[PDB]
Every structure is written in C-alpha cells, then in structure tokens.
C-alpha cells in the first residue's frame, strides 16, 4: 500500500467504523454523525459537543435529501476542511 493510498483508505475505515450503528451500514445517520464529530473532529462545533450545529451540519451535508450523510457527501466535508487548512498554511509563510 502506498502512502497516499493508506491515507485514502483510512478515511474509508473511519467512516465504516462509525456508520452502521443505526439506520444503515454505508450511511451516517444523525446519531452516528454526532459521535463522529465528538471523537474525530471535536472542536469544530461552535456548540462545543452539543447538538444544534450537528443538526444544521447534517442538513448542510445532506445533498440528496434523505437526512443521511453518504460518503459522497461526507468526503466533500473532509476535503473542504483539509483544503482550508492547507491554504491557511500557504498564507502562513508570509
């Protein structure tokens, strides 16, 4: 396995290790999404670790209109966060 491949693979693992508690097995429900944010990325939530923003975030990620976060929509979130971080480091050198 190559370095970049491992990075991409780990994202799939993290997802599959959270989605499957309820609702489906390949989709993140509202309950599972909260657990994910309360573990993997705890701090991005303006509400600390409560709901509120979690519910709004779900509606923001939900593009198909099922109230469930699929990998196709979840990967966008991850990509956006990483992109913004890199861009920040790019302008950090100046």
């Amino acid at each position: 396995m190559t370095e970049l491949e491992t990075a991409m693979g780990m994202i799939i693992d993290v997802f599959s290790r959270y989605s499957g508690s309820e609702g489906s097995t390949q989709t993140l429900t509202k309950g599972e999404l909260k657990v994910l944010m309360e573990k993997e990325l705890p701090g991005f939530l303006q509400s600390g670790k409560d709901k509120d923003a979690v519910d709004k975030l779900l509606k923001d990620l939900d593009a198909n209109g099922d109230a469930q976060v699929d990998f196709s929509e979840f990967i966008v979130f991850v990509a956006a966060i990483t992109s913004a971080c890199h861009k920040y480091f790019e302008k950090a050198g100046l």
Binding site: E38, K39, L41, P42, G43, F44, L45, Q46, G48, K49, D50, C85, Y88, F89, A92, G93, L94
Partner: protein, 101 residues
C-alpha cells in the same frame, strides 16, 4: 513569517500562554501548527477532548502546559481561534531543544 525563539530542554516542563480569546463566551479553537509531516496536530474543543490533551493540557485561563517537552513537540506552534464572524490570529512560536536529533 516571524517566530519567537524559545530555547528549551528535553524532558523539561514548559508552560505557554496562548492569548486570542476576547471578552466573549468560549468559542471554537482551531489549533494548528507549522511542521513538515505534522505529527502534533489536533483540533481542540472548549467542551470536548481527544488524543492530545493527555500530552498537552489546556488551562481554563488560556494556557498550555507540557509535562515534558521532547523532540516531537519541537516545532512551530500556532494557537489560532475561530469566531463565527471570521476572526483568527497569526501567532507563531518556535521551540528549540538543546539536544536536537
């Protein structure tokens, strides 16, 4: 880029004061840093924790305490916060140990 020079020792307990929080309710802290591969990175939460707090503890007054600075914590840290109005800070600190690998 500008960074403050901080001479440290391996295995020495250091305390750092990271300002940025105004006279408003505790907002989200998008902690970051500048490194090559970046090992010591972890988004902090005012209500939640994670694999990092066990190493570096954040005091309620806005300070970071390191029980023993090694060679992994040797780099350029950046205590950045993020307000819902789009407000952050460009604070960079460079720690350097006497025993560099």
């Amino acid at each position: 880029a500008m960074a403050q020079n901080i001479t440290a020792r391996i295995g020495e307990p250091l305390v750092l004061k990271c300002k940025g929080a105004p006279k408003k309710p505790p907002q989200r802290l998008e902690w970051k840093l500048n490194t090559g591969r970046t090992e010591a990175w972890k988004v902090l939460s005012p209500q939640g924790g994670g694999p990092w707090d066990s190493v570096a503890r954040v005091l309620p007054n806005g300070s970071l305490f390191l029980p023993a600075v090694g060679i992994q914590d040797e780099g350029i840290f950046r205590c950045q916060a993020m307000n819902r109005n789009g407000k952050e800070t460009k604070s960079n600190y460079r720690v350097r140990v006497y025993q560099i690998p």
